[PDB]
Design an enzyme around this catalytic site. Sequence first.
Site, mmCIF file in Angstrom:
data_model
loop_
_atom_site.group_PDB
_atom_site.id
_atom_site.type_symbol
_atom_site.label_atom_id
_atom_site.label_comp_id
_atom_site.label_asym_id
_atom_site.label_seq_id
_atom_site.Cartn_x
_atom_site.Cartn_y
_atom_site.Cartn_z
ATOM 1 N N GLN A 156 1.545 -7.381 -5.402
ATOM 2 C CA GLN A 156 2.673 -7.429 -4.480
ATOM 3 C C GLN A 156 2.658 -8.193 -3.152
ATOM 4 O O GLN A 156 3.766 -8.555 -2.515
ATOM 5 C CB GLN A 156 3.070 -5.797 -4.048
ATOM 6 C CG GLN A 156 1.823 -5.267 -3.094
ATOM 7 C CD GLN A 156 2.266 -3.716 -2.746
ATOM 8 O OE1 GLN A 156 2.002 -3.016 -3.590
ATOM 9 N NE2 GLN A 156 2.909 -3.582 -1.440
ATOM 10 N N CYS A 176 5.873 -1.838 -3.321
ATOM 11 C CA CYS A 176 4.992 -0.845 -4.293
ATOM 12 C C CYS A 176 6.015 -0.110 -5.068
ATOM 13 O O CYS A 176 5.768 0.137 -6.194
ATOM 14 C CB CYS A 176 4.304 0.075 -3.388
ATOM 15 S SG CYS A 176 5.209 1.355 -2.442
ATOM 16 N N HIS A 235 2.906 4.939 -0.496
ATOM 17 C CA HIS A 235 2.232 3.976 -1.383
ATOM 18 C C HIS A 235 2.711 4.595 -2.872
ATOM 19 O O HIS A 235 3.034 5.769 -2.938
ATOM 20 C CB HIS A 235 0.920 3.595 -1.198
ATOM 21 C CG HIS A 235 0.674 2.442 -2.273
ATOM 22 N ND1 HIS A 235 1.465 1.428 -2.308
ATOM 23 C CD2 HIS A 235 -0.503 2.158 -3.067
ATOM 24 C CE1 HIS A 235 0.793 0.325 -3.126
ATOM 25 N NE2 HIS A 235 -0.378 1.014 -3.590
ATOM 26 N N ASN A 238 -3.292 -0.123 -9.409
ATOM 27 C CA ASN A 238 -2.621 -0.387 -8.289
ATOM 28 C C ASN A 238 -1.890 -2.019 -8.278
ATOM 29 O O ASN A 238 -2.076 -2.695 -9.395
ATOM 30 C CB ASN A 238 -3.847 -0.477 -7.196
ATOM 31 C CG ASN A 238 -3.212 -0.321 -5.627
ATOM 32 O OD1 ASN A 238 -2.037 -0.307 -5.300
ATOM 33 N ND2 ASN A 238 -4.141 -0.066 -4.873
#
Length: 215
Positions: free
Chosen positions: A19, A25, A158, A178
Amino acid sequence: LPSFVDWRSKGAVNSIKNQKQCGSCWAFSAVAAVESINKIRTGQLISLSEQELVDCDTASHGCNGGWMNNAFQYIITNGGIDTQQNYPYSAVQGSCKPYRLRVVSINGFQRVTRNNESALQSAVASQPVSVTVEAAGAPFQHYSSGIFTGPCGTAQNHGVVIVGYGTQSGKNYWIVRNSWGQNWGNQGYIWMERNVASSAGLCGIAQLPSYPTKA
């Protein structure tokens, strides 16, 4: 109910993304979940556009944040989402492309029972699930490998995706995807302890799970 699940081994998970310097996110988490259910239902794994969400989901806040559910709602109302190839990631909010295409679509989304890791396990057994985690702590950010056991808080700062679960030498874990690139964690992933004492889950991972549906 399977004792081990890893959607990456089923070809339902895209290569790790990054990102970069944009608070997106929420878009990466939502898109990853959509890419996976599309593969599970249609047999094709297509990389979709996080940028479209950043630019076009006016209910969200661009690079200043947003929510996965907002993203699912946008995809449903828009009638689909374009590919990463046709709408590349720029890590900055720009003009929502007027002639973008609707390549992949979803029929809705489900909210998993909150603060219940058992309910979350059942959901993950069927498909990857979008969740929040508290990832501002040093322990989490410097994670390299193995099963992460904390410490961390419960703030929903997040958004990530759970792509699997299992048990290794007595320790239950979640496989978490992630969006900080391959140079973070274990090639972009983090193994987090599962079935902890707190009902909110480790780093609050069980607080707000949801996933897209496609008939």
